[PDB]
Amino acid sequence: MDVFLMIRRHKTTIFTDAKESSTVFELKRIVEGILKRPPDEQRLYKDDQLLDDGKTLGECGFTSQTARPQAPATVGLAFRADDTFEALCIEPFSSPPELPDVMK
């Protein structure tokens, strides 16, 4: 099937799907589409570990099982500026309040 993803950099977060057989470069070519940056100036990570440009999404560990529409897998993103890639920073989302007392 397809893998469903969140591609996250600083406070931006992209919802996009892709094929398991489709590659990392092809995925960078999506991000280019959206954010208008060449695949050259992009690094993609799973967790905290950089992804080979040639390796397929399946090989990287993205399965239909691990990357569902309702529960998409997170790809990290870094951008070059000034001839060096920045460190991969992903702003966390807000926290929910503690569960109400009636909710327990």
Binding site: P100, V102, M103, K104
Partner: protein, 149 residues
């Protein structure tokens, strides 16, 4: 009513498949169209059932009476078995609206006596209190069948 089983008295072998994560209560609409419960399928499980041509079936969460699909649709009525081959009723979750789905979940954490104590719009207490109801769904469905010319 319009929505009732025809007393055809002609048997049909059916298969109920519960392809939902819910416990499914199959609901038979008798000849007067009053809903009659039948034994539940656990999630994943499937079972043969002896029914008859023109008998109206409907499937709900046994715990919460949430609506479920059968063959991607609201109702199930078996034809005649073609050369004694069983009719199949594939039961699944619908794509609930996020609003309804949220309602399901909050109902599951909160006693009706405490809907009012939640920190939320006065409208939503009314939605929460509007429990999934077979009877109510039948009326909406009966108006849908009269509005097919």
């Amino acid at each position: 009513p319009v929505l009732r089983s025809v007393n055809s008295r002609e048997p049909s072998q059916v298969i109920f498949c519960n392809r939902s994560p819910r416990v499914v209560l199959p609901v038979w609409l008798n000849f007067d169209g009053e809903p009659q419960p039948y034994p539940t399928l656990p999630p994943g499980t499937g079972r043969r059932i002896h029914s008859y041509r023109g008998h109206l079936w409907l499937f709900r969460d046994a715990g919460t009476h949430d609506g479920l699909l059968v063959n991607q649709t609201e109702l199930f009525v078996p034809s005649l078995n073609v050369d004694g081959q069983p009719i199949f009723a594939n039961i699944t979750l619908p794509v609930y609206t996020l609003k309804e789905r949220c309602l399901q979940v909050v109902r599951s954490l909160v006693k009706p006596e405490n809907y009012r104590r939640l920190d939320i719009v006065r409208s939503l207490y009314e939605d929460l209190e509007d429990h999934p109801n077979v009877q109510k769904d039948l009326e909406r469905l009966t108006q849908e069948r009269i509005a097919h010319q």
